[PDB]
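Reminder to self: keep the SMILES exactly as supplied, no canonicalising. Ligand is OAN.
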Amino acid sequence: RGSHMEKLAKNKVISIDAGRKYFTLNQLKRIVDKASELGYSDVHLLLGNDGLRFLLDDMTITANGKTYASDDVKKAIIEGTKAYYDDPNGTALTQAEVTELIEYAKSKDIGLIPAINSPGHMDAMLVAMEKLGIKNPQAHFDKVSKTTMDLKNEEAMNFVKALIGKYMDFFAGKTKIFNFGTDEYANDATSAQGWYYLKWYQLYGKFAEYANTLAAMAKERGLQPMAFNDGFYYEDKDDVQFDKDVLISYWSKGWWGYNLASPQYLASKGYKFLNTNGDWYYILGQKPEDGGGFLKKAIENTGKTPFNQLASTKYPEVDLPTVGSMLSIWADRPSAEYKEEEIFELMTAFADHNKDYFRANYNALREELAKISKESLEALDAAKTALNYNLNRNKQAELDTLVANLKAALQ
Ligand SMILES: CC(=O)N[C@H]1/C(=N/OC(=O)Nc2ccccc2)O[C@H](CO)[C@@H](O)[C@@H]1O
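Structure tokens returned for the bound complex:
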């Protein structure tokens, strides 16, 4: 049970699935603002998750000894993403929009953590590849996957690695972490038994090297690699080795015949966790009747599930090292309406149940600071000096008073 300092140093992350579904820059700014207000440290933004919803200004890709022109890559990606879900609200964020988003979050002490999913959840990239002349990028098992790249297809792999590298190059120097996903390999084509299928066809070693290369690409570009736990040391076996520097976003140990590594086992291999507990999931539009991650359950679970409790473990009987925790908003059915206040209420309850971990609200202090002769310059200083930047969410009134004193002095 940490000191105030340890508690505040942990990441508090709100995750938004803008891979499946379009979110405007304004919508994401409002999320950033609300995250800042409630005391979160980061917004985790999925840009590639099924749909690919982010184009750089220059999308020229070099791979397979060949060159794929920027205009063609954009067109193919737009077609890929539209084939997955032609969202009426928009298709993809631009490079200027994400740059502005990052610079807005930074002004509020909020990090951005981008996620570009592969080799699963990459519907949009698969079709984009077909459009660029890359035949059969899809995994084939019980049927031809719509979500997952064939690991035997070197043409497709090289392209995707080049694509992901250009994304990484953009986020280099702008964000600390890059999440490359790897959750649910070929779920759609194996009845959600993808890992078993990879092991069956002796392609799991091939998955690992793919995962290890993305990890290496991230580190080389000065980005801390992150990935979902699913495909790491599946079934607690270690004949296939994984990069030990990946931050594991741990969400679940899986279900009958989806026998993921335990958090105990990954901690024994040296891993650090971002606690992305499935208990906190909310899928837009999910009703109580539907079961699963509906709003009332997620809200209840921010109460029942301790901040540090990794899925499948009881806290504190099992106490594993985490850098923080992440509450996740998903868009499984992307035509469900995004209701801002649902997300806000859920964000609020997670903060309200963990006040020791969340910062106080510094938006009014910032607003006041940017408003700035005699012994009245002496006063403005003594108020400036009395500012405390270390206050948690339990101490908002204390902060309000310090801000009130500084307002007084500036008048
Ligand atoms: C890492 C993660 O949360 N992956 C998927 C996800 N996986 O949740 C599962 O429980 N998936 C699952 C179901 C059956 C067998 C194996 C995995 O949940 C979110 C909400 O449904 C989806 O948006 C995600 O894409």
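Points to follow up:
The chain is about 40% helix and 15% strand.
The first strand starts at residue 11 and ends at 17.
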